[PDB]
Amino acid sequence: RDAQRMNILAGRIIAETVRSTLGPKGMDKMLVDDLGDVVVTNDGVTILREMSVEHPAAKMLIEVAKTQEKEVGDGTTTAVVVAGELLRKAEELLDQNVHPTIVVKGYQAAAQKAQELLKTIACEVGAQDKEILTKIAMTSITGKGAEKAKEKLAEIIVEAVSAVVDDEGKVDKDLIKIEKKSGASIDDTELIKGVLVDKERVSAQMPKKVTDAKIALLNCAIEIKETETDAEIRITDPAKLMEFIEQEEKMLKDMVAEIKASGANVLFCQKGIDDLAQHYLAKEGIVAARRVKKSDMEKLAKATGANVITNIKDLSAQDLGDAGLVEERKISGDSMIFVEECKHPKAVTMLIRGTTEHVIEEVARAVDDAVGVVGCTIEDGRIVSGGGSTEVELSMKLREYAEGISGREQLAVRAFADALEVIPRTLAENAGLDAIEILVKVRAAHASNGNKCAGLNVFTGAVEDMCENGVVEPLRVKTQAIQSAAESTEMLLRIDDVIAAEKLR
């Protein structure tokens, strides 16, 4: 009969399935299909991509979340819980002979006024202050899941993201790279000065240690050339067999000799080399290597300032580059020259050590994520009181502003402020504490001239400061989440009624 009731009601069912999955701790709800593949995932968008929707109107509320996920990723679920709340309150006002045009006018006006509030409530932090940066380091280590050593693994990350920052103050995730390797503990990860390669030579004949040496960059191959004009190969002399085995082997003896005369003690080529040529390198003392990734040849010259060369047939003395820092060290046996820097890198690599691959994979997925959550702060430079601590403050500012606007539209403005009280409610119900009995204390702090970084701690379970413990998130997440929900929920209310259109393509 009403039609619109079934539409707004369908959206609530989608929020309840993701309302309890908010915050770090939260149970999961798997929805296995009739196939048999049983999968479980706590993330939000992962459940939306695999879900059998009932009504077609529900797709409108899901499309708006996919666009926000590709931008920031985190915070998309925060806009769905608020949607299900502001829609439920519409029923309480719809029965009061209130037309949807008056309700939509409140959200559009209240959402715009909120833009001028987060700018003042947000805190300013510089992308250099170590006193404030170290505090953000311990905030991310606790969110993911690794409190066994939040003091050592956090300090190494502070000096990493803070050193790879460019002059303008930006940073990208492509410059960070993670690896894995066995070890005795998790405190051996350090940094020296140089560059590392992600591939090792497939032989044990060339030298293995040469103190004080120069680096040489090569890229050319050794395959037979090919003329542009077409042609066909024809063989009619079976005698040609026991000739190229010795002739081809001689073309490399004189080629490698030119490399030593130029003054290159180290070499990093791509293709392979005959065995006889490798024996000479051992007596001459030229710790050479082969098989290198293309992306690796770009950071050797950009860090140490070497001169990258593309041709191997010609190699003069000027083509020599320069080494950064050579030092000896054993890697659970063989001793190579592995050193990395962080002043002006291109693809820094960290050697994670551990006793078992289990703990290594856990911390391995934490260092790469630490640069993502922190990389955004280095670019923007504006943070707020996350963890539902910034919404309680807006509840007091909107009420004072609602008194200025008169008429029947003031009812929708007050409902918007109260609708934001669901963020701390869901986080409280998951911990087992009565929200009605704790929400009265958090408001007491924000009574007049109280701190603005106050909130509730899920661990201790008491009112504390957010900037002190560790609850911080970017600004674009909260600001865009409220704006995205305002423009996403209005599309559901502006629908006059269903239509029986035929042949909808």
Author numbering: 18 to 522
Question: What does the published report state?
Answer:
Chaperonins are homo- or hetero-oligomeric complexes that use ATP binding and hydrolysis to facilitate protein folding. The group II chaperonin from Methanoccocus maripaludis, MmCpn is homo-oligomeric, consisting of two 8-membered rings stacked back-to-back. Chaperonins are further divided into two major subtypes, group I and group II. Both share a similar domain arrangement, in that each subunit consists of three domains: an equatorial ATP-binding domain; an apical domain that is involved in substrate binding; and an intermediate domain that enables communication between the equatorial and apical domains. By contrast, group II chaperonins occur in archaea and eukaryotic cytosol and have a built-in lid segment protruding from the apical domain that opens and closes with ATP binding or hydrolysis.
